[PDB]
């Protein structure tokens, strides 16, 4: 008979794991937004690589609500809406599916089916101007409860009752925007904390933000399976002194056979060899 060697492993690689994805600005900038005016950003049409999210300042929270925080890089999501806003310390626990209060009841309320990850961290150095940075406001005294992902940027004077107040303020009348005091004198729980709530919408339509490719290693001098770049195959991999002119991806011999793959994400001249 004719006994051969069967491919030991199935180590493969892909042309660059991921592309440039905008996981900054809503995650890393200066002035963010305000609770009353939650921002938004529909990231799509890009290979979502959530690895940059982890290599960031020790955060004060990473609670994922519905999705395993370890499988974000492997689930094809349809849309992801990043929402950034700066709240205080005692309000970090209020932003969560099913929790009420006064900063998540009328300012920003998440549904009871919110399949996302809330990310919070301390910002007592970038958004803590002395004497109190009064630029941030938080909405209060809403006529009714808020809805999942509902904006409230009105500034009409609201009163408790039986008090005419249209454009002027008073004792029982106040504007629906109150400043936040960000001073180092204030203890923990009153400092500014930035929160970005990635809302991963899970559906059945073609996903526009899939996770990065599973490019493995480059086991050499050992018979293995191959998917380098996109062609499938099987064989041993050596190191050749050939010089594919800067454009030639695959290689070929005098028999129309794949015989030299180019390191997808390492720009190198490997040479495929037969598994006897």
């Amino acid at each position: 008979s004719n006994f051969r060697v069967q491919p030991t492993e199935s180590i493969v690689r892909f042309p660059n794991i991921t592309n440039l994805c905008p996981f900054h600005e809503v995650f890393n900038a200066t002035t963010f937004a305000s609770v009353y005016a939650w921002n938004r950003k529909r990231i799509s049409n890009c290979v979502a690589d959530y690895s940059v999210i982890y290599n960031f300042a020790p955060f004060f929270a990473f609670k994922c609500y519905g999705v395993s925080p370890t499988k974000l890089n492997d689930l094809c999501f349809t849309n992801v809406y990043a929402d950034s806003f700066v709240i205080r310390g005692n309000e970090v626990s209020q932003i969560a599916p099913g929790q009420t209060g006064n900063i998540a009841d009328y300012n920003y309320k998440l549904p009871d089916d919110f399949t996302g990850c809330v990310i919070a961290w301390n910002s007592n150095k970038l958004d803590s101007k002395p004497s109190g940075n009064y630029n941030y406001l938080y909405r209060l005294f809403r006529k009714s409860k808020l809805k999942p992902f509902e904006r409230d940027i009105s500034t009409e004077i609201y009163q408790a009752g039986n008090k005419p107040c249209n454009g002027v303020a008073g004792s029982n009348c106040y504007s629906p925007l109150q400043s936040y005091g960000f001073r180092p004198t204030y203890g923990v729980g009153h400092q500014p904390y930035r929160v970005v709530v990635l809302s991963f919408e899970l559906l059945h339509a073609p996903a526009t933000v899939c996770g990065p490719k599973k490019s493995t290693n480059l086991v050499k001098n050992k018979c293995v399976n191959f998917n380098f770049n996109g062609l499938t195959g099987t064989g041993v991999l050596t190191e050749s002194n050939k010089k594919f002119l800067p454009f030639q991806q695959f290689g070929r011999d005098i028999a129309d056979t794949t015989d030299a793959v180019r390191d997808p994400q390492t720009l190198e001249i490997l040479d495929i060899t037969p598994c006897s």
Partner: antibody, heavy 122, light 109 residues
Framework: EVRLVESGGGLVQPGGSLRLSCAAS????????IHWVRQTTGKGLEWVSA???????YYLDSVKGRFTISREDAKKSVYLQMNSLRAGDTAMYYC????????????????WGTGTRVIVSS | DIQVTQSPSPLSASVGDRVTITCRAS??????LNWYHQIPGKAPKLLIS???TLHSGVPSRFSGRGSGTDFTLTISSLQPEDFGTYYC??????????FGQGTKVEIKR
Amino acid sequence: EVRLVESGGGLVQPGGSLRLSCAASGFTFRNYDIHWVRQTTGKGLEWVSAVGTSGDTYYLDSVKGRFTISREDAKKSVYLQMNSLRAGDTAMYYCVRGDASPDNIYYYMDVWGTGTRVIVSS
Amino acid sequence: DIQVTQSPSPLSASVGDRVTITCRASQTIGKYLNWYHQIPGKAPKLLISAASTLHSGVPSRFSGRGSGTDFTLTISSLQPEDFGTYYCQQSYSSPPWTFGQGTKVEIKR
């Protein structure tokens, strides 16, 4: 078939530092996330302090700082080093392979291990 | 947070009975729950995952149920190996994967 050894041992004193290990035997160590559950004799399977292939390293808020997870695919095992331990970390430590369904998200911690043991008295 | 109030601690039982282990959550966790079984002197193992999808190797009428906050492990038939501590685990919690308190199904005389 698919076992998880937990040869770490423990006989530390208050303020010590022991180092555990969980070496798999039967699946892709890479394509799986190894956690670390703990059972006080007279309590309930505790936290996870999970580690991931994307280098994600999770901890509990009441154990953070005095804990450091480390995945090392070279010897197909993970490690769990701890700083000064109080008198509340004396328990049977375990290591599990938390996983969800294909693209579904139901973490079911299915492959449990042996049973490491920690004590902090005389 | 999201707590789980399993059945009262001691659940007497006979080799053949309808055992009801209740797991009620503080919110609507939909269909994110995992049932476990820890026999005294051995490592726990999975029984029901995702509320009703038994994993494998758990076949003794270990039926699950529930799709909101309250879930029930309906054991219709019991064997000597169907006795031990049972735990619930809301998958809707993620970073602090919280388990249950524990319910020991014992034997009756």
